[PDB]
Amino acid sequence: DSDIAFLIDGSGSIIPHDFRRMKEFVSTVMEQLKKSKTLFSLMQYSEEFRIHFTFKEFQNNPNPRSLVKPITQLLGRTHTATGIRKVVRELFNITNGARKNAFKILVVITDGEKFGDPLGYEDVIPEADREGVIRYVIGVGDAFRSEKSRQELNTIASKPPRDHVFQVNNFEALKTIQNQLREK
């Protein structure tokens, strides 16, 4: 009943310690939701974009370790808004294994410093709402330490922000998603 896509920040500002933590966060969400009706898909972005697995590819090989282990960090600039547009148009496409009546969830993992993107969040967030995608944001590094990055996380997340913005250092986001999925 639910299709969950990950969009993870592989840009130069993300230190390898945090990138590693993104990989274990994503893997743990998948591992915890195994034996459920959830499909998973993941894109890494910087100034380039890498689909590491589609929903269909997860369905054919639902092994979180096998799917996430070979992921290496892109480095480069931070095109978060374009990444969101590509997730919506490509990952949640039926050609890639996305399902018609599935509950759509996007989990964006970033430090909240979009940089060099020709697109603004105003260019892509409406499209995300148009396709019914629920957006959770997982902050990393110093995302919560300045007002600019805090507000950027809020801008990406579905409303209200306090229900959709979380940290990579814990699994509160997973608890919330599990609760949402249970209720739904």
Ligand X SMILES: CCC(C)(C)C(=O)O[C@H]1C[C@@H](C)C=C2C=C[C@H](C)[C@H](CC[C@@H](O)C[C@@H](O)CC(=O)O)[C@H]21
Which residues lie near ligand X (CB under 6 A)?
11-13, 77-78, 113, 115
Q: How far is the CB of 166 from Mg ion (least distance, A)?
A: 19
| Stretch of 33-41, 73-81, 149-157, 169-177 contacting Mg ion, by CB under 5 A | 73-81
CB atoms within 10 A of CB 53: 23
Total chain residues near Mg ion (CB under 5 A): 3
Half-sphere exposure of 114 (CA within 13 A, CB side): 20
What is residue 87's DSSP assignment? I
- Which is nearer to Mg ion, 3 or 18 (by Cβ)? 18
Q: How far is the CB of 130 from Mg ion (least distance, A)?
A: 27
| Stretch of 57-65, 71-79, 136-144, 150-158 contacting Mg ion, by CB under 5 A | 71-79
| Phi–psi pair at 97, nearest 5 degrees | 100, 0
- Which is nearer to Mg ion, 74 or 87 (by Cβ)? 74
- Which is nearer to ligand X, 50 or 77 (by Cβ)? 77
Strand 38-45: give its sheet, edge to edge: 49-53, 38-45, 2-9, 103-110, 134-139, 165-167
CB atoms within 10 A of CB 75: 14
Site track 78-97 with Mg ion (rule: CB under 5 A), x = hit: x-------------------
Cβ partners under 8 Å of residue 68, min gap 6: 23, 26, 27, 30, 42, 52
| Stretch of 27-35, 70-78, 83-91, 162-170 contacting Mg ion, by CB under 5 A | 70-78
The yes or no reply on residue 11 touching Mg ion (CB under 5 A) is yes
Q: How far apart are CA 184 and CA 179, in angstroms?
A: 9
Q: How far is the CB of 8 from ligand X (least distance, A)?
A: 13
